[PDB]
Amino acid sequence: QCVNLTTRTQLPPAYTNSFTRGVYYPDKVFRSSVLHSTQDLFLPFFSNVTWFHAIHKRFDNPVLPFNDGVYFASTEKSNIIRGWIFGTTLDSKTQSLLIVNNATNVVIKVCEFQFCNDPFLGVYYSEFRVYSSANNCTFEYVSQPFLNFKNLREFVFKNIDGYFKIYSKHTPINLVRDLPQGFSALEPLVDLPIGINITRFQTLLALHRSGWTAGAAAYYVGYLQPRTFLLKYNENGTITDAVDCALDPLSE
Amino acid sequence: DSTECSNLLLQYGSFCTQLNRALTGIAVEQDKNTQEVFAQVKQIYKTPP
Amino acid sequence: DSTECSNLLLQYGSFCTQLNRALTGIAVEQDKNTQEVFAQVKQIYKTPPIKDFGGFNFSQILPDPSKPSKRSPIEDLLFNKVTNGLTVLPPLLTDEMIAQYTSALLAGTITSGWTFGAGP
Amino acid sequence: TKCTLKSFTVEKGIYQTSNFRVQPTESIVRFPNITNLCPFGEVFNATRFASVYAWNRKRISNCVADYSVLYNSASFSTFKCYGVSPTKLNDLCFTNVYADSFVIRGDEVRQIAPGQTGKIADYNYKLPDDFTGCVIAWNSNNLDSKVGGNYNYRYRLFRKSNLKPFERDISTEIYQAGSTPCNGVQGFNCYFPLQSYGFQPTNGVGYQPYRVVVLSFELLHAPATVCGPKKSTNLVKNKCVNFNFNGLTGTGVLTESNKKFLPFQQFGRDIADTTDAVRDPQTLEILDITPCSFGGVSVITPGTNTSNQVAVLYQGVNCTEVNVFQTRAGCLIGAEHVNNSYECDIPIGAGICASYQSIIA
Amino acid sequence: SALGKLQDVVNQNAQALNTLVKQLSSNFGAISSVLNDILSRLDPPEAEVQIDRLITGRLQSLQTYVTQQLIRAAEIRASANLAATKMSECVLGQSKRVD
Amino acid sequence: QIDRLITGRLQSLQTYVTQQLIRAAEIRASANLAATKMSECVLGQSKRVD
Ligand SMILES: *[C@@H]1O[C@H](CO)[C@@H](O[C@@H]2O[C@H](CO)[C@@H](O)[C@H](O)[C@H]2NC(C)=O)[C@H](O)[C@H]1NC(C)=O
Ligand SMILES: *[C@@H]1O[C@H](CO)[C@@H](O[C@@H]2O[C@H](CO)[C@@H](O)[C@H](O)[C@H]2NC(C)=O)[C@H](O)[C@H]1NC(C)=O
Ligand SMILES: *[C@@H]1O[C@H](CO)[C@@H](O)[C@H](O)[C@H]1NC(C)=O
Ligand SMILES: *[C@@H]1O[C@H](CO)[C@@H](O)[C@H](O)[C@H]1NC(C)=O
Ligand SMILES: *[C@@H]1O[C@H](CO)[C@@H](O)[C@H](O)[C@H]1NC(C)=O
Ligand SMILES: *[C@@H]1O[C@H](CO)[C@@H](O)[C@H](O)[C@H]1NC(C)=O
Ligand SMILES: *[C@@H]1O[C@H](CO)[C@@H](O)[C@H](O)[C@H]1NC(C)=O
Ligand SMILES: *[C@@H]1O[C@H](CO)[C@@H](O)[C@H](O)[C@H]1NC(C)=O
Ligand SMILES: *[C@@H]1O[C@H](CO)[C@@H](O)[C@H](O)[C@H]1NC(C)=O
């Protein structure tokens, strides 16, 4: 089942500042009270991060590139954002990745989904229209639920050597509109052995029905580049500060 | 300007950093030597006409 | 702890002995330097209990009896302001004995002037 | 001391002769508590394999793997391993195993190697230059041959570019070897990319069907899943033991650590880039690896003209791990400690000196 | 920054020790920088080559460290001789030497 | 071949830096002597013979 959404309002996507967000733990090694220099796929400091809205009539589900990696920020309240779609052609010709977080659990499936043009979820005030078929499935993984704007969700999606690394951080905030300025190191959430080609990704949202109404939410998409960071590990093994080695001569 | 040469040179580690640091120490040592020898007065005196 | 690595290392000869000899020479040279700088007096002089020096105050440079380290306030400030087969050998003269040597030199130069450096 | 100084007369003083390090006592192997065997049988003893252009990859994780079953059995003509020893594979732990099975001819068995060229290496199956694993090839004449020709095993003969390592290509498009477009029809200068082996049992040993399984081991930084059949021993602490924690080998003293590991972290490391903390695979306990007591042995002696009595100093070693006297410089054996103070004759260190009067300190 | 000379000497010695320890993390062209991994992964014919590469790299690093240690020892010896001269001439007597 | 050139040039550069350090120590000793002569012979009258 597929449904066209024909009540959208045309608006260009916005841009804002990354500040000092997007830092994740580069490896699974404990380090304490040290300054460690690492070269990895990181989000540059103070970069131009793309801003998408969900407000009522805005419903931003565009076609975005994946490139090397994706930083996904979410200023979320009342749980509209439910999952992501990864793939290359997003049809039955190639194999695609489904990540969903419904009311019970988080489901990861690697199948050849025949995706709809407008994949979405729905809340009645009981609606699931994402794909029409799933024929060849190789990987399944059922896990715990991962999840004024009250909640900040940071995720980092990387695909190296057939491994999909998802890094996550949950932050209590009270800022109304933009990204708060500060530092928060993203802990690794899951490592998935999907082994598939990913060049395009989709955000999955949830409708609110009595047509449809979009709940208030906002998300941000940034792109990772290979660069060097100097990370500071405190006495408790937590990354408390970082330096972008190629940003400006002071940090260099 | 050979990138393959630099890629092979990266196998040897931080030798270049040590050589640059030693030369920098020598270079600041020369200025320190001149400062100790000649700058022994903080008043610039002149002879009478 | 690899025996095969040491067996292969024995092909290079007495390089390890040379490096250990050089490090031992440096280590004894540091103790010789400390002896040359601080151990210039064979008498441990002490100040009199009454600090009557004609108005001159030496409390900031004489050792403090209240402190367990027996250091001067200036020396205490100086000590506060300075912060896989490797071993650190302790120095032959400890910090309290070096402080005792400096205290002896201070007592000699206060109570006797330059006379203690040339004789009795 | 006489042998070290290369002289029969030793002057008065202290001389560094050798180094002391405490030997390990026990050996402690800690592997995860898994029992289920991963299907090497379904990889090797399958009824029908796949062709080399569509080579079959099976992911292997979370198992005990007995590699000496594959090694010692007299069934594989080639068991040639790259980057690891075949006999040592029982004593190692890997995060993931890729088993890539296909069928080729005998003369193409050589082409399954890093840094080699041919039709299979360029167009069908490419191995990276940093390959760590084994290549296991055995003859399959009774299974893969038939009188009149077995044409169900095809290899890719034509491609525009060479394959990347571990890239699978199953596309069937007509190769344009000339200027004329092919439009999906074979003909002049337009060939099908897949070419049949055409196996017969009367063929030569070069044209003979060999089944090849390539095992590649992910040794990268990750939790280890595939482990050998080595049995786990009980944990002993506060002693110098050799340890094998999930394939990580070392020698040290395992103690309790106050380091609060995050739950995704297995190892610990410091500014010296040394593994000083590990997570126990079984109890999920974080253990501090303090390396064991060591130091130098110094022989304190007077002149051989005076006396032949000697004392030994173990530098930076406490006296309980070796006339016993504990100094800050180390443990001193053979010299009696006195409460009287004299001038320094033989320097020991940390305010301690030695003299001869017996040897006193 | 009053006590910069002593802190400079302490920092130089600590940095030399840190560099010498850090040089163990380099493989010097071998497959790994850990000797136990090579001894547990490879047969002795190729482990001999890998251990030989590690030995020559670490020996070059150690000789370099000893060379700068000897140079710094000479510098510290000159400074200590100057300090002994100042102790003899300024503390134990009155000096006519200007500055 | 490039590795042979790299190790030869690196050995040459290490030799150059080592001899430069030795000459720097010698020049530092000479400069300390010159500063002592500046303080004691120019800024005052010295009783030291020669
Ligand atoms: C929702 O809209 C999309 C695009 O507006 C529809 O996709 C097209 O559907 C027609 C009819 O089947 C095809 O001829 C086009 O080729 C499709 N476009 C693309 C790019 O593939 C989609 O069918 C609509 N959904 C429903 C349920 O009608
Ligand atoms: C010498 O100097 C010390 C320190 O300046 C004097 O000690 C001070 O004495 C006053 C009055 O007794 C106290 O209020 C201060 O707290 C003391 N300071 C310290 C650091 O002890 C001392 O009085 C001076 N004179 C003599 C003869 O020692
Ligand atoms: C971000 O990009 C848009 C267009 O791509 C540009 O107009 C805007 O100025 C950029 N912002 C920053 C901070 O660079
Ligand atoms: C991944 O997909 C893109 C486009 O879908 C393609 O250009 C690229 O070659 C693919 N890579 C692999 C390894 O299949
Ligand atoms: C969530 O999804 C899983 C699998 O897709 C399903 O088993 C479960 O019933 C779903 N829960 C709800 C509340 O829809
Ligand atoms: C994928 O699914 C299609 C249709 O369900 C089937 O024809 C095809 O063989 C499948 N591919 C694999 C590799 O199983
Ligand atoms: C580290 O953890 C301890 C709790 O044991 C806490 O008291 C301390 O503040 C923490 N350090 C930092 C920098 O947060
Ligand atoms: C395959 O089957 C034979 C039966 O004779 C057995 O001996 C052999 O061990 C099996 N191979 C594997 C890998 O299990
Ligand atoms: C097996 O290992 C788990 C850790 O995943 C541990 O909780 C459990 O107690 C172990 N069981 C036995 C019998 O050792």
Numbering used by the authors:
A (entry chain A): 14 to 69, 77 to 145, 155 to 176, 185 to 247, 257 to 298
B (entry chain B): 745 to 793
C (entry chain A): 745 to 827, 856 to 892
D (entry chain C): 299 to 620, 641 to 675, 691 to 694
E (entry chain A): 943 to 1041
F (entry chain B): 992 to 1041
The authors write:
The Delta and Kappa variants of SARS-CoV-2 co-emerged in India in late 2020, with the Delta variant underlying the resurgence of COVID-19, even in countries with high vaccination rates. Herein, we report cryo-electron microscopy (cryo-EM) structures of Delta and Kappa variant S protein trimers – both in the unbound state and in complex with the ACE2 receptor – to gain insight into how their mutations underlie changes in ACE2 binding and antibody neutralisation escape. Within the receptor-binding domain (RBD) of the S protein, both the Kappa and Delta variants share an identical substitutional mutation (L452R) with the previously emerged variants of interest B.1.427/429 (Epsilon). Finally, the P681R mutation (present in all B.1.617 lineages) immediately precedes the furin cleavage consensus sequence (682-RRSR/SVA-688), with initial reports suggesting that the P681R mutation enhances cleavage, and consequently S protein post-fusion transition.
We solved cryo-EM structures of the Kappa and Delta spikes at global average resolutions of 3.16 and 2.25 Å respectively. In contrast, the global reconstruction of the Kappa variant S protein uncovers a previously unreported head-to-head dimer-of-trimers phenotype. Unexpectedly, Kappa variant spike trimers form a structural head-to-head dimer-of-trimers assembly, which we demonstrate is a result of the E484Q mutation and with unknown biological implications. However, for the Kappa variant we report an unprecedented head-to-head S trimer dimerisation, likely facilitated by the abrogation of charge–charge repulsion and the additional contacts afforded by the E484Q substitution. We found this head-to-head dimerisation to be concentration-dependent, with no evidence of dimerisation in experiments conducted at <0.05 mg/mL (see size-exclusion chromatography, and negative-stain electron microscopy).
